[PDB]
Amino acid sequence: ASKRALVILAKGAEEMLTVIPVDVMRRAGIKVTVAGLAGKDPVQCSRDVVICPDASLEDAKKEGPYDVVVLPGGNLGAQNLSESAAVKEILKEQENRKGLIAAICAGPTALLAHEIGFGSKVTTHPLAKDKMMNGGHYTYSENRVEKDGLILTSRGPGTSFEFALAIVEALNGKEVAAQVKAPLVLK
Amino acid sequence: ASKRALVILAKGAEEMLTVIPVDVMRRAGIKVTVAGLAGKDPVQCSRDVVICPDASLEDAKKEGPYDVVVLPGGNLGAQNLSESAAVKEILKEQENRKGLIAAICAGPTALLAHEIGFGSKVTTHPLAKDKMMNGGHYTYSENRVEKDGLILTSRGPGTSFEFALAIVEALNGKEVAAQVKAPLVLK
Incomplete structure (x- = not known):
């Protein structure tokens, strides 16, 4: 039985932050569904890549x-x-069933909006810190990837391989993550 | 006057190797055209991302x-x-006009196919070395990014930010590259 991932894709999403996790998770044999928030139609990302x-x-x-x-x-x-x-409902249900939630860069600010994971250690892009920290509901970290139990966060394009491999490790284990990592030519 | 980039997108392209350079070049103010080899239609990439x-x-x-x-x-x-x-013609014309050509991972093997840049130092993904080196027409490098004049090559997903920023530096200069790099959260 393979593990399955839902990637929620909205207008203005960062296309690197979408594609790197999708690709790396598929390399790990995870069954990934790229789901459009607005429907089935193509999505215009932040730098105008259309997915x-x-x-x-x-x-x-x-x-x-x-x-x-x-x-x-x-x-x-x-x-x-x-x-x-719809995202509120999905995230609450995932939290209620003790399933992993992973968010990168400004992505974690959606956890704040939906009151998900309060009391967790989190990171975000540096420019998203103040938004994420409004109310002091999380403890901030500058780690490139932060995982506090079932809340996994990361910082930006340059941490997205580390983020994706952390998801792989959480779902499929350290050995699969290491095997997927080697052909990527990471530094 | 802004610089312009042509990114040639074919079925089975590595989606990370497509999106990272497109996005980073657009962050640098380069006017990027993502051109479909086969036509205007959506392109199914190697890990099934559709662009x-x-x-x-x-x-x-x-x-x-x-x-x-x-x-x-x-x-x-x-x-x-x-x-x-069509790619043969574009690359020959680019070479003839002394314009930059940039290729990443197995991408440089298309330079071999089209007899572009012989005598240059190049790198590729490790698994593409033997193909690239058939005939000894290039000198191989293990540098993460290699630039021998107007032929710029790189190795894989994990070198794609370095590759894209090398393109930015070549077109827009070191200072623009540094400014684009900082918000990416590279290590």
Whole structure:
């Protein structure tokens, strides 16, 4: 039985922060669904790369649950995630079933919006710290990847391989993560 | 006047090796055209991410010339690039006008196919070395990014930020590259 991941893709998402985790998780043999927040239609990312989702979020939700829910960053993408009642429901249910939630760069600010994981240690992009920390509901970290139990966060494009491999390690173990890492030519 | 880049996107291209350079070049203010080898239609990448190109290669060619032509990797994508007469023509013309050509991972093997840049120092993904070196037409390097004049090559997903920033430096200078790099959270 393979592990499954839901990646929620909204307009204005950071395309690197979307594609690196999708690709690395697929290299790990995880079954990844790229779900469009707004529907099935192509999604215009922050730097104008246009990605076609595998399914709408509505449809993907019916095929869950997932071993991880992944929230890419990009400020406008994170805002769209934060404003969505559907994302609220998915994240609450994932938290309620003790499933992993992974968010990168401004992505973790959607956890704040939906009151997910309060009391956890988290990181974000440096420019998203103040937003994430409004109210003091989390403890901030400058680690490149932070994992406090079932809340896994990371900082930016340059930490996205580390983030993705941390998801792989959490789901499939350290040995699979190491095997996936070697062909990537990381430093 | 901004610099312009042509990124040639074929079926089976490595989506990280496509998106990271597109995004980082756009962050640098380069005008990037993602051109579909096969036409305007969406492109299925190696790990099944589907990207919609900005234009067909046929149309993009008419809007050149470009300050850089970028060839992503992915073995099947590189093979498609290598089999295309249109790519041959674009690369020969770029070489003839003394314009930069940048290729990452198996991407440089399309330079071999089209007899581009012989006598240059190059790198590739480790698994693409033997293919690239057939005939001894290039000198191999293990540097993460190699630039021998107007032929710029790199090794893999984990070197793609370095590759993209090397393109930025070549076109827009070291200071712009440094400014684009800082918000990425590189190690």
